[PDB]
Subunit: 232 residues, 4 copies
């Protein structure tokens, strides 16, 4: 079976608004997969593929179009990332680091992750999966790319993930570009994960594929998604 | 801008489970549009197109795959529907009726709707849109069709829609097939819609396209979606 | 153990706003218990004691200076109630009728309840308990009584109760005064109660005491409370 | 008017459970007040009074009894506190320190608070108020005191506060006793506070009084409350 959660996210550019070409309401389809783990999840490799689309269904009210996408020459066909993460789930403190690479225009990426403090964690690593990369979304289908456009200044995101069994996980993130490398700094605070639930019992088996709806809200973007966590 | 809401739905077949071929986790993309309205929304025409898909992104872990879709000869390529709806929003009681037709395998359908008691309504008709038809989803991409398979016995759905400004709308529905016509009986109970919000002030302009995730669960299938209501 | 739910309620007065005397933010302490049950919960007896208080704690800021309590000549020291209930929980349809007597100023009332239709219920009767009487709250500590003041016109209430395991029950209610008897007409719509949860498994044993915070909002009052359902 | 929020808290003792006398379900009534502020809320003085009670309404079960309260001589009639706080709201990072004193058995306390980093804050200080002391609750009315009993080992708490306009604030806290002084270490992570809302616009004026319901949940206590934030 599955345990469901809901994500509510706000994405904020550090680039002045007058310099951003904004998208309309759009959708990002994703498949985030665990590729490898070692030593009770103190080492994890994750891969994600993410493709943006405007709704392609026919419209009876007429197609409202745009002026195609955006350009961001600071973001190359191949990019590397480095990440630092710190936080708490329930009463348990931890730190992680990761490094990876991907193809920002093709929407694919890999992260190799180490738990460097607080390991092994008392909770399923799956609940951290979405906190490890918005620059790697394929927006080539004519959608202005809020994320790639944000450079050199970069952007932040902030999110609340609400699990249907009481766990709540907030996360805040800073994304910068430094000497050609993307740098992520992430902070996590999760609370009220049930002691008898699959997260604290480590009885999860990764995420199903997902769709996120993104929409303009106050100069930035907000996102909404429901995700399904596979259970043992 | 937009007002967001979240849908949590349980779909229950009246057909014995041993006679149902169940789908895996899948997604339905929709575009529900208002085609016409008259006399302050006491007459409304709605159209929907709905297309089911499994995740089509490549997988690194390779997938189980499926054994194809299902067959349901009772559901013809053209079908008619009749609907009766009764309920309350806040303190306001009302009844609606509708009739329509569509193409269940192509995923398209039209409803022509009349408010027959309690009109004109003091709230935006848009909050009733999703309560007016699961037999009309295109599952031809090889996804077993829980809804079409449920006939002749039929199925029910029950849903809570939670608006981000406090409105909550529950609905329960019975779907039957009588003399070749689909018959819908729907009951609505909405509460706490804010007096100063766009619903009670009638400042809404229809729904954005949406994606619903459906998965085998408590009962038959459960569904999750977030929808974005356009604002004046 | 306990199962926890949250109540959000809006109370609307039929009587014009100008006529009504409005209370400051205040809290109602309630103990609701089931005196008797029979025939698989087909017949239930419920007793409620409700007392209303302004905060009794000392204030350094020193805010108080209430103009005093309201007068409701229409409401006698002893009052009688007749109730009609129609509801659906999940896919189940039921009808309930009740007759009761109480001392409104005292804040004590007794209800004798019969399940006319759909008995025996497949779900715990406990979820229904809140739905079955705001006129019977002791406001004699100088708090203007929004409910007693509403007569002869009467009032409505509307509520969503959200259970921490997914059940959601909305209810709307009309309160009138006819030939000296209080008349309640209530409508219930519950959805998504888990098949493996204590409500559907009938493993509950009544409610703990509660406190509701009430505050002026838009037109009338809104209320917020959390309640704890005892488990077997 | 008011902006409402909901608090869900888990309280965990660091003392072995076989050394704790647990309370039954109970209620804590509080009045938290701002006494002084200076320099755009970069200095704040807060006072709280908190009194625990079992329900004191009569029962028809007439079946309620307890062994009375508990004893904790490490907690003296007067106690001092020192606090360190760090966190983020939306995209804004900050740190605070405080020191104060109180009467743990009378349920009163005062904290003098400084914003030491990230001041002045772009959000209402009110949203941090509940993160600055459970040892100072008057449980003298025969209720076992989970918090006072936890010493010398101490306890933690973790909380999610959900505002009805989208703001979500999680907090985690460690409480220890060091050389006779209570030491608090608090971490805050708030997200999605609306730019047009009273928190980000600094249009708030403190909290109404509140009641928290506490109940045993898996070796420790859980708490539930709704709080009302006064608006300008």
């Amino acid at each position: 079976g599955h345990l469901i959660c809901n994500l509510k996210t706000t994405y904020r550019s550090k680039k002045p608004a007058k310099n951003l070409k904004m998208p309309g309401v759009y959708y990002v389809d994703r498949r985030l997969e665990r590729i490898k783990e070692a030593d009770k999840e103190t080492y994890v490799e994750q891969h994600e593929v993410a493709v943006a689309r405007y709704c392609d269904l026919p419209s009876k009210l007429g197609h409202a179009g745009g002026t195609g996408g955006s350009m961001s020459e600071l973001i190359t066909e191949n990019m590397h990332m480095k990440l630092y993460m710190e936080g708490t789930v329930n009463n348990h403190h931890f730190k992680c680091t990761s490094e990876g690479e991907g193809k920002p225009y093709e929407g694919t990426q890999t992260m190799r992750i180490k738990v460097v403090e607080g390991g092994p964690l008392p909770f399923a690593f799956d609940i951290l999966a979405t906190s490890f990369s918005k620059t790697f979304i394929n927006h080539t289908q004519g959608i202005p790319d809020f994320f790639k456009q944000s450079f050199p200044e970069g952007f932040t995101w902030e999110r609340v993930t609400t699990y249907e069994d009481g766990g709540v996980l907030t996360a805040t993130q800073d994304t910068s570009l430094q000497d050609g490398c993307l740098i992520y700094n992430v902070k996590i605070r999760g609370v009220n994960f049930p002691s008898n639930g699959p997260v604290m019992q480590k009885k999860t088996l990764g995420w199903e594929a997902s769709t996120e709806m993104l929409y303009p809200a106050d100069g930035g973007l907000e996102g909404r998604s429901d995700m399904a966590l596979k259970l043992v």
